[PDB]
Design a protein around this ligand. Sequence first.
Ligand SMILES: *[C@@H]1O[C@H](CO)[C@@H](O[C@@H]2O[C@H](CO)[C@@H](O[C@@H]3O[C@H](CO[C@H]4O[C@H](CO[C@H]5O[C@H](CO)[C@@H](O)[C@H](O)[C@@H]5O[C@H]5O[C@H](CO)[C@@H](O)[C@H](O)[C@@H]5O)[C@@H](O)[C@H](O[C@H]5O[C@H](CO)[C@@H](O)[C@H](O)[C@@H]5O[C@H]5O[C@H](CO)[C@@H](O)[C@H](O)[C@@H]5O)[C@@H]4O)[C@@H](O)[C@H](O[C@H]4O[C@H](CO)[C@@H](O)[C@H](O)[C@@H]4O[C@H]4O[C@H](CO)[C@@H](O)[C@H](O)[C@@H]4O)[C@@H]3O)[C@H](O)[C@H]2NC(C)=O)[C@H](O)[C@H]1NC(C)=O
Ligand code: I3P
Ligand code: NAG
Length: 559
Amino acid sequence: KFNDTLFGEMLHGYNNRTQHVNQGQVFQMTFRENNFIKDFPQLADGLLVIPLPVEEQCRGVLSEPLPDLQLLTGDIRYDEAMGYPMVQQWRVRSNLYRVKLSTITLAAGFTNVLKILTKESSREELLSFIQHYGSHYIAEALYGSELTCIIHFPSKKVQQQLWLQYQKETTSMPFITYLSGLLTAQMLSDDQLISGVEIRCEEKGRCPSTCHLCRRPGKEQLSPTPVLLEINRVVPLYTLIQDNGTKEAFKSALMSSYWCSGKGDVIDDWCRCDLSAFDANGLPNCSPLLQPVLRLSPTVEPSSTVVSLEWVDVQPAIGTKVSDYILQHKKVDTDLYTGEFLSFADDLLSGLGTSCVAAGRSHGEVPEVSIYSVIFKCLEPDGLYKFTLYAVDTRGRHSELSTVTLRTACPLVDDNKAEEIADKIYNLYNGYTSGKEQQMAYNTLMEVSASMLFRVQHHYNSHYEKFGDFVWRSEDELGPRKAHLILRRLERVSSHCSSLLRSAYIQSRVETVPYLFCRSEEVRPAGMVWYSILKDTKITCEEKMVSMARNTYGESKGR
Ligand SMILES: *[C@@H]1O[C@H](CO)[C@@H](O[C@@H]2O[C@H](CO)[C@@H](O[C@@H]3O[C@H](CO[C@H]4O[C@H](CO[C@H]5O[C@H](CO)[C@@H](O)[C@H](O)[C@@H]5O[C@H]5O[C@H](CO)[C@@H](O)[C@H](O)[C@@H]5O)[C@@H](O)[C@H](O[C@H]5O[C@H](CO)[C@@H](O)[C@H](O)[C@@H]5O[C@H]5O[C@H](CO)[C@@H](O)[C@H](O)[C@@H]5O)[C@@H]4O)[C@@H](O)[C@H](O[C@H]4O[C@H](CO)[C@@H](O)[C@H](O)[C@@H]4O[C@H]4O[C@H](CO)[C@@H](O)[C@H](O)[C@@H]4O)[C@@H]3O)[C@H](O)[C@H]2NC(C)=O)[C@H](O)[C@H]1NC(C)=O
Ligand SMILES: O=P(O)(O)O[C@@H]1[C@H](O)[C@H](O)[C@@H](OP(=O)(O)O)[C@H](OP(=O)(O)O)[C@H]1O
Ligand SMILES: *[C@@H]1O[C@H](CO)[C@@H](O)[C@H](O)[C@H]1NC(C)=O
């Protein structure tokens, strides 16, 4: 049967790869020593439970707002006027205990199988041990009750307004409960600044009755049992072998299961895949080549004619090495069609190239994982684009492909010029007679872009619709092929633009943002069947700046 007690997972053993606790039973649980806490039963022997200080108990932290990274990976889609959808995390910890174990004798069943395997040096056998007992045992861990909530805002603007609106009316109340208060009360009203806000919570261990920051109407509870939150320290199970002969042979079997998928031995810096791990093309397949997740840049919202993308290196610390990243891109309108092919090593770092595409490599969250990036600066406005990415290893395998589809913003529109043209066109249509007027009216309408023509239609109908619709009146005064010609141009404007271009006001802000521009100093030696490691390529990186002109839509100029 399964021996289960509180604190709990410390005696059973932990796997690093699959991240599962309760993997066999490493240490024995006894109750000779008398360890109690509060209302909990008798603790197992040899584990030290220390409640955290009162400063840490029932304390909540509100993270800074960031774009929703999940909504920047696949079919990327958001209102151009809104911007990136934002998320902000709220987290409250309430029933905290720090749990270490020292000192405990080993389990009976653990030592039994440890006694028979220590002489039997076998690979398939040592792997079945790790399946059952895991790889480590937990040395230090944090237990308690934590409530993790995520506030989903529709835009960066909506949040800032809500945060300043909250900061005014509070100066008592946390930010999330103020939002939840206005979310629940919205059943009284309807549309407002809080229209699209959503809150999503997930609880590890129920909220205690004493703490008021994690209190949720019905889920309150008196003295809840603490749940494992963090694993602070792990120690490998080859510490427990007690001999040098087996604990070196066990260690190599552990590295095989972790780094080489259990189908190969690890020489320093790489996996020696035993046959037949090799794939369909006869290339080493024991170390996994992961899918690189292509992302939009969180810091640079795409503008019309411009997109900048990111991805984190898929190269493990041990095993596969990435030699190149292949990035294809096409404008759709098709499907199942191959577009421009860009090798990161050959086309982006070595061959210009510029000034339409630039690449870059940077240090990421915690080195050493690299953050590759590429920026497109000569795209076309109001166009749907598809970017695909895959990695190529040193021995030639392709990774699983990854895709991003998104649309560049609408073209820029001088709203003053549009309302000015609409008046010019109306006073010509009221002049009637001249064929110069007819030609000049047709010329000015055709010489300006389709989005501008859609905007002068919006302005003409806003003012002069009672004396004739823009289309209908253009047909009366100019003739109907010139009309139909004007009219077809309006059809080339998509209708997210056409929706946005029916707004009250369109204003232009100009953002200026940096991007990393890296080039390859050293051309690396490549063989026929093997290639050079892309990470080792020496590169010279320089910071540059893009100016990004954007339209600003709204029903009034106050933002
Ligand atoms: C859950 O479960 C597991 C539980 O254990 C966890 O698994 C552990 O993960 C750790 C983290 O990833 C692992 O630690 C990392 O190991 C790697 C691999 O190191 C081995 O190979 C190295 C390769 O050496 C090359 O170059 C030397 C020249 O000096 C040559 O001699 C070699 O031959 C080899 O290259 C060529 O080999 C042949 C030619 O012979 C050809 O095919 C090619 O030409 C090859 O290129 C090697 O350096 C290591 O050697 C150490 O160990 C020897 C004994 O085993 C010892 O004799 C050595 O002296 C050395 O020990 C000392 O030096 C190292 C390095 O300074 C120290 O780490 C160590 O503590 C000692 O001081 C080893 O054989 C290793 O590369 C990693 O090191 C990088 O990352 C750490 C960050 O942790 C940095 O601090 C380092 O500076 C280094 O960073 C540099 O390199 C990166 C790679 O390019 C680069 O990205 C960086 O920018 C920077 O340049 C780590 O040490 C650990 O091994 C692993 N354990 C097990 C049991 O699997 C798992 O992670 C965990 N998961 C969790 C917790 O989430
Ligand atoms: O050391 P060099 O001069 O750069 O060239 C090595 C050579 O191409 C080996 O054939 C190759 O191993 P295999 O062809 O057998 O796969 C090795 O890769 P590796 O050491 O990472 O295995 C390369 O490093
Ligand atoms: C349960 O605990 C006993 C110690 O009394 C131990 O002998 C037994 O092996 C444990 N059960 C399992 C499945 O490990």
